Amino acid sequence: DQTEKTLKDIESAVIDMEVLSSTSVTQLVRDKQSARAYMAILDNEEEKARKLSVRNADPHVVSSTNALISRISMARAALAKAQAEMTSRMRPVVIMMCGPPGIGKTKAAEHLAKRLANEIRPGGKVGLVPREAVDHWDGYHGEEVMLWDDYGMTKIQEDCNKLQAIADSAPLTLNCDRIENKGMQFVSDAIVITTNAPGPAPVDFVNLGPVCRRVDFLVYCTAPEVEHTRKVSPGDTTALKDCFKPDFSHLKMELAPQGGFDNQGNTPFGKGVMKPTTINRLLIQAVALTMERQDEFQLQ
Amino acid sequence: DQTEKTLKDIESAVIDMEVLSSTSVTQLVRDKQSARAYMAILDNEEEKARKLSVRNADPHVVSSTNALISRISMARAALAKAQAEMTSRMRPVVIMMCGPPGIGKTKAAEHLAKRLANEIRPGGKVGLVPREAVDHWDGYHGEEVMLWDDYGMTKIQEDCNKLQAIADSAPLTLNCDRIENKGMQFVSDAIVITTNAPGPAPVDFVNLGPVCRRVDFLVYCTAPEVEHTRKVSPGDTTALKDCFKPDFSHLKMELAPQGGFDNQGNTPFGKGVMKPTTINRLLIQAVALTMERQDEFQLQ
Amino acid sequence: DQTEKTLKDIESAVIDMEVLSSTSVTQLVRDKQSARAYMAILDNEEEKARKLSVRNADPHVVSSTNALISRISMARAALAKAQAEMTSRMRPVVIMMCGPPGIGKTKAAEHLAKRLANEIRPGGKVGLVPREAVDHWDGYHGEEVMLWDDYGMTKIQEDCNKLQAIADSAPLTLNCDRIENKGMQFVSDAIVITTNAPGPAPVDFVNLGPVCRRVDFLVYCTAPEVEHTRKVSPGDTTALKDCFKPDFSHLKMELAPQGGFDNQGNTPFGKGVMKPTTINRLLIQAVALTMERQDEFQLQ
Amino acid sequence: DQTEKTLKDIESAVIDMEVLSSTSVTQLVRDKQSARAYMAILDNEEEKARKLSVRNADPHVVSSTNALISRISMARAALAKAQAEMTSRMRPVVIMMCGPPGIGKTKAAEHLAKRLANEIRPGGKVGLVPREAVDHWDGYHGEEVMLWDDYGMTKIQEDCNKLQAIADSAPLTLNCDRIENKGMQFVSDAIVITTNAPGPAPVDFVNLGPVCRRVDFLVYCTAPEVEHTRKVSPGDTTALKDCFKPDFSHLKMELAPQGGFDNQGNTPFGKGVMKPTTINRLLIQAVALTMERQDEFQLQ
Amino acid sequence: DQTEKTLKDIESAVIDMEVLSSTSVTQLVRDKQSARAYMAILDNEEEKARKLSVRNADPHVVSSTNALISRISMARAALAKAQAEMTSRMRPVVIMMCGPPGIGKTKAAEHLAKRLANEIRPGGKVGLVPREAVDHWDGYHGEEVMLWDDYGMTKIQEDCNKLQAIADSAPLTLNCDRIENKGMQFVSDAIVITTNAPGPAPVDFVNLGPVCRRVDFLVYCTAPEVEHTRKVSPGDTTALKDCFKPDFSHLKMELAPQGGFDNQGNTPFGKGVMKPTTINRLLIQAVALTMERQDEFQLQ
Amino acid sequence: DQTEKTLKDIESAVIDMEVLSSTSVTQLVRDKQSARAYMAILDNEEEKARKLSVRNADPHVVSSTNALISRISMARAALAKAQAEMTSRMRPVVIMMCGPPGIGKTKAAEHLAKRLANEIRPGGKVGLVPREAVDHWDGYHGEEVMLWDDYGMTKIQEDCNKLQAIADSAPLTLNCDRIENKGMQFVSDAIVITTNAPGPAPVDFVNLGPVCRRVDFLVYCTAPEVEHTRKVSPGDTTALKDCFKPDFSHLKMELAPQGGFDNQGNTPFGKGVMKPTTINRLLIQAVALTMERQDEFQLQ
Ligand SMILES: Nc1ncnc2c1ncn2[C@@H]1O[C@H](COP(=O)(O)OP(=O)(O)OP(O)(O)=S)[C@@H](O)[C@H]1O
Ligand SMILES: Nc1ncnc2c1ncn2[C@@H]1O[C@H](COP(=O)(O)OP(=O)(O)OP(O)(O)=S)[C@@H](O)[C@H]1O
Ligand SMILES: Nc1ncnc2c1ncn2[C@@H]1O[C@H](COP(=O)(O)OP(=O)(O)OP(O)(O)=S)[C@@H](O)[C@H]1O
Ligand SMILES: Nc1ncnc2c1ncn2[C@@H]1O[C@H](COP(=O)(O)OP(=O)(O)OP(O)(O)=S)[C@@H](O)[C@H]1O
Ligand SMILES: Nc1ncnc2c1ncn2[C@@H]1O[C@H](COP(=O)(O)OP(=O)(O)OP(O)(O)=S)[C@@H](O)[C@H]1O
Ligand SMILES: Nc1ncnc2c1ncn2[C@@H]1O[C@H](COP(=O)(O)OP(=O)(O)OP(O)(O)=S)[C@@H](O)[C@H]1O
Ligand SMILES: [Mg+2]
Ligand SMILES: [Mg+2]
Ligand SMILES: [Mg+2]
Ligand SMILES: [Mg+2]
Ligand SMILES: [Mg+2]
Ligand SMILES: [Mg+2]
């Protein structure tokens, strides 16, 4: 087997990456894309050494693989420790879609999320925001984008509290149950949310302003053809199946002023104007805002 | 020796599974039948290796078997990881039977669940939905079909919340008390439910629309001969014992318009009509809908 | 010597048992008596193996016994898995005794439960139902008969919920507080209940019909001599102790039509008549019904 | 060395005792004295074996000693299981002292409890019932006698329910919070209650008769001398000291009819007569009743 | 053989630290800056030893490094023991910023915390206070400044209890979950807090006075231009963002009397007056107070 | 071999200690000072053994050190068993201080605690009692004096329960998390408590008298000059500092009647008179009382 040459190559890779990491850890952690790439490369080298050890029974290969796993673990631990000491995080981009039941919010949100995660980085991931009745985050791995379906189904005050905690630039600790997950932090870039409620928070809620100002895009949706069909021919499934289109052109979307809390233009401070929009335009605006915030956080 | 022959066979099988996983993973997880076959093959190879190891004590044999077990576990973990990060799931098929007490709903539900599980896949398995007194999902193993009896017995609103959560195409994390089951999800293909309440949810409930649209087949059951005999010959066990047939002829079934909530054909949006049905026709329709949805999920 | 032949016999027993299990696991689990007998034989084998291992001291016997107990545990685990995969259980036989205070319902119920447990299976056990202030089932082990000493004392509607849950053929999950007890279900064959209330449920309760149909035998008890003795000469302990009898002749028993809720013969659907009865006749009838149900559940 | 010979001796005793447990499980679990002595000897043997193990240095003797320890552990577990499988328990002897404040019934109750505990078994323990504030029983240790001070106090419905639960011959399970405390029985033999209430339960309580029948000795206590001293010489400490006596002769006690609930001799069924008594007659009668019940249960 | 020479130098440094520690543990404990520098040097040396051990593979270097780290751990444990027995600590300096939402409290607080952490020590760190949903302090590493964002968002009274416990000179033990972190204490020097509430505690609170006196600098903030722009042009993101400045000139700050609880000058024991302040005046005053307290504690 | 001679001398000293303890178990277990001195001597022997092991590690020397540490462990286990088997242990002296907020109670309490610990024994330690947020005692080391601050801040009921449990003369077992700590006894001579609430318990507490009787010294504090200044100059911090003297002469201390619950002299048994006191006078009286209590416990 060509074990010696691959071992030498991975040795060179790990040593050069070790020195590179040791150089400027502070700027590296403030550079999100570079750090993510470095972690991915470390994982690739680790799994490659693991499989190389697995397929060979030579004790020398096993010892070398153990040494390389030791080195890679040390580097990953040092970088993770530097990242935990940070005192700020980027402010995530939050999109919240409100509309009647059965019109297509969930599948549109899935499309938006995948497009965004691809745009931020090739190989980006989508994660799940645990909902009420689950109080820990042990399924979380720090993905680029997060999905939150049925926000406000029941217990909307707790939904507001979670949203205020995570939609911010101040660091945050997350409750976990497993021993090795204690002391985890929320470091995702974007959040997409679907709800049936009339807004982010109730109009009599104490923290109305704090939660409303944290939503970057607040979209209100309808679908006239779906609703008309369901109204005139109840129980007919083929017609309704015909009312939906593969480019989401059945959804009619309006956008509210940044910081609003209903579909009439009211914000906690003044009155603005609603404006029509589509799903491509929303994707373009969201991508632009994400890149802008990323650049300004790098320059911070 | 036959032992080394079986060892070579299982080595070839694990090599085939490894190369299949390495080639493509997203297309494999998007193909539910192929992924399940993959899992079955890996489980059978693991069990055969374990029993063969137990039947002997040769150091070389145990070493080879432990290495093979490690490789099998690695492949299984990789597939599990790929499935955990899916952004969508197939929408389950949900049947809810309402009717007066004592007439035979639970038996019909078990018949339907067995046949459905076998038709979806040879060796289907049916599982249990925890009821309102149990708040954790330990004891769920990703079953093809799930059975849920006494829906709305005391706490119909928590049952409504649970049903809305699980019946969807949005991935979901379940609450479990063991550490090793932490952050697991719901991946079932159908749910069969029996009820004594007038419908899926109260007419004054807030999430009436969201809950009703998620019910695929709403069946209303009666049994006139049984009710007559237990009315005119109370306390007589034998006359009542004689009113049940081994093919469910005693049950008389009506089907409501998809999205309704009562006997008279009312829906949240319109006013449709009822339709007489039988248990076998209902089964054929459920199989047809399950196949349609599975093909669409594989394509999308 | 004795150890060699004993371990050879144990090996033969375990191998033939493994063959039988592999052959007809499903038949066994559907055949209650055979499954119970095989489980008891496995318990005997494990106990004998551990005793023999402890008695002697040398590597050969200890290693052989360890392997044997491991294989026995694997067989028991596979059988338990198959038993947990079932879609149905046998409907338990339920007896409820209602009468005025201080006449001897508890002693009679213990007599009945002991006789029933002995008849269902030589060496059967009797367990306890967590009454009302304990919400967990961590003492439950899967006994033949269950004893419910007070029912409806302080919260009768919660008692009705629990009785509806456990008196069924649908598989059930039990709430437990220990880690190793998570995902436990109810498999007992008979339930004897003593009460101080008018009937199984309040007359205006909402689930009267569901809970009253599930009581096989509803007995109303009295003791005219005891009541006369304590009404004419209050405070006399000697006369009271004189009143009772070792053969339970002091109790007079009436039987209501099945599905009734009071002692006037009323049922939720009709109106029957009351019958006289005794403890021995009750025991004979209950054994007959239990064997009938066991045979019919097995023959499927 | 000598460690051989001694081992033989001690181990023989172990197995010897095992024999008298194997053939007499019913008797040992029936009578508390024999089982208590058996446990005492078993733990003495375990301590002796630990001492020998720490003293000894031969691998063979420590192997034998740990084998003996395992044998002791399994025997103790068997005894515990047989005890936990009981379908009945001995009925407690319950004394209730009804009297106004500032007469000295708490010290009298402690004296009675101590003498009873010594009589029932030498060097017995005395425990405290949870004080209507903790709903769990974590401190409980199965004491011979239980003392309940200030029964009632505006929370007498819950106290009535608790007394009905514990004063019985049916097995009971207690609510706890610790993992190892789950599923705990009740095993005490006598209860002494002191209260200011006018009886065991309110005259309108639903469970009046059931609660009244379980009280063995209901004694109404009065101290005319102390109340006279308070009337004549308020704030006089020397007179306060003078009124009390070391022999409790200052307490005037009326014994109520068996099963009564009032100081006028009223009973839920008839009318009786109050009698005069004292501390020593009460203690003698309690001891006699306890011995009667204990032997009756032992032979059954 | 430079590795041996550097290892000998490290050993000499370890011996120097060992002899230094024995000088006076009590005074070194009293001197916080010296203790922090000593621990920093110790951990840096140990990390260097471990890294150079990882670089090499010969037994000699690893053995020498194990001995050196054993000495290092001995010293670290001795100093930890000395530091754990103290009966007093120093009072942290507490800054609390109160103002309307969205004006820049969190970013100003981050600025202040960074500057103050560097001012206290060259290279000091900032850490995160656990919030109401997280229950354990496993992310705490004894950092020199602490951040607390969103104080009193949901449960203000629990926040008051926590702040009263941590702002004090009495030693405090912190709840945690990992075993090795059982029994660690709070040792930070400064705390920076932001809130939307109108003061440290609600006026009707039982512990108003105890909590108010523990806050050293209470600042009330307002940004009139930001409020004007967001009121006149609701939804104009660029116009609003043009109002924020890199020198925090947009935010106007008034300092309240030591011990006050609102912005009208009121104190629990009287009424004072408000004064104007800025970022740099706050920073200089906080540094002066911190240095004063550190010196006074040193002398004590 | 000087190492062998030193090890033999240490072993002979250990054996002498064992024989002295065995022949004088009662005195060692009773006299607190004797037990502390014995523990310190054993700790010194352990330190010498560890130093000897560092000096040499020959296999014979290793075995000798193993035997020495085994002897020391035997001594520790014997002492622990004797103390656990002890019927009772000396009860501590409680000094509770109450007063307005921010007058200097914590610093005075620390001063008094240090002085007491030094008086009772040279090099006497001081410990911190866990507060409400912590429920485990893993940081307890059997200190001479315990210090408790902010008693009754949030959990006055649970604080009262802990005060009743802790001052009792019966043996008490402490909760702990780590496996070794499990089985931890409480042994300490004095408890100094600083409070903001009036009196040890509220006037309506059912166990008011029982918890008051556990308090030996009850001090009420007032600092009239500090209060007047902070009333007249709310914001002047230097003026506030001017009022505190390094001899604690700014405090005014009153002492309440034995058993009292408030500062007006009222007692459960009547009423009394307050007295002036000072910190040194209180210290001398407390030392006298603790010495008398220890003497009477030892003499028996
Ligand atoms: N783009 C689409 N292509 C095909 N079918 C669609 C599409 N969008 C919606 N549907 C159909 O409409 C159903 C509604 O799906 P969802 O997107 O979950 O609706 P919804 O708006 O989330 O409803 P709520 O508010 O959660 S009750 C789907 O299950 C499909 O049957
Ligand atoms: N197909 C059948 N064959 C034989 N007996 C039957 C059949 N269906 C019902 N029964 C009998 O009728 C009883 C009715 O029980 P279930 O089937 O559980 O009725 P149900 O509709 O679930 O009533 P509820 O709503 O749960 S009270 C059964 O327990 C059997 O004794
Ligand atoms: N078979 C019997 N032999 C001897 N004494 C008996 C017998 N049956 C009842 N007794 C006596 O009568 C009492 C009645 O006790 P229980 O059996 O508990 O009566 P009960 O019907 O359960 O009353 P409730 O409803 O539980 S308050 C017993 O405690 C005995 O003293
Ligand atoms: N025989 C006695 N010997 C010595 N002191 C006694 C005696 N009887 C009463 N006393 C005193 O009387 C006091 C009254 O206290 P308790 O005995 O608790 O009164 P009590 O009857 O319990 O009041 P209640 O009903 O619980 S409020 C005791 O604390 C003793 O000091
Ligand atoms: N100094 C600044 N430099 C640049 N942008 C700023 C600055 N201050 C505020 N902003 C912007 O305004 C937003 C206000 O954020 P925060 O500082 O978190 O406000 P806030 O005072 O904490 O509001 P609350 O109380 O948390 S609702 C920031 O997220 C930035 O987008
Ligand atoms: N002897 C002293 N010398 C110097 N400053 C003192 C002295 N006593 C008190 N002070 C100051 O006054 C403050 C009062 O704090 P504490 O000693 O904690 O008072 P306190 O009695 O504990 O108040 P509470 O009840 O905890 S709110 C201290 O933090 C010091 O700043
Ligand atoms: Mg949706
Ligand atoms: Mg049913
Ligand atoms: Mg009873
Ligand atoms: Mg009393
Ligand atoms: Mg903020
Ligand atoms: Mg204080």
Residue numbers in the entry:
A (entry chain C), B (entry chain D), C (entry chain E), D (entry chain F), E (entry chain B), F (entry chain A): 64 to 363
Text from the published report:
The viral non-structural protein NS3 is a membrane-bound AAA+ ATPase of superfamily 3 (SF3) with multiple proposed roles in the norovirus replication cycle. SF3 helicases typically assemble into hexameric rings and couple ATP hydrolysis to conformational changes that generate mechanical force on nucleic acid substrates.
The HBD and AAA+ ATPase domain form upper and lower tiers measuring ∼70 Å and ∼105 Å in diameter, respectively. Unlike the C6-symmetric model predicted by AlphaFold2, our cryo-EM reconstruction adopts a split lock-washer conformation, previously described in other AAA+ ATPases. The six subunits form a right-handed spiral with a rise of ∼1.5 Å per protomer and a gap of ∼6.5 Å between the topmost and bottommost subunits. In five of the six sites, resolved to ∼2 Å, we observed hexavalent coordination of a Mg²⁺ ion by the β- and γ-phosphates, the side chain of T169, and three water molecules. Subunits A–E show the γ-phosphate interacting with R276 and R277 (arginine finger), as well as with N259 (motif C), supporting their classification as ATP-bound.
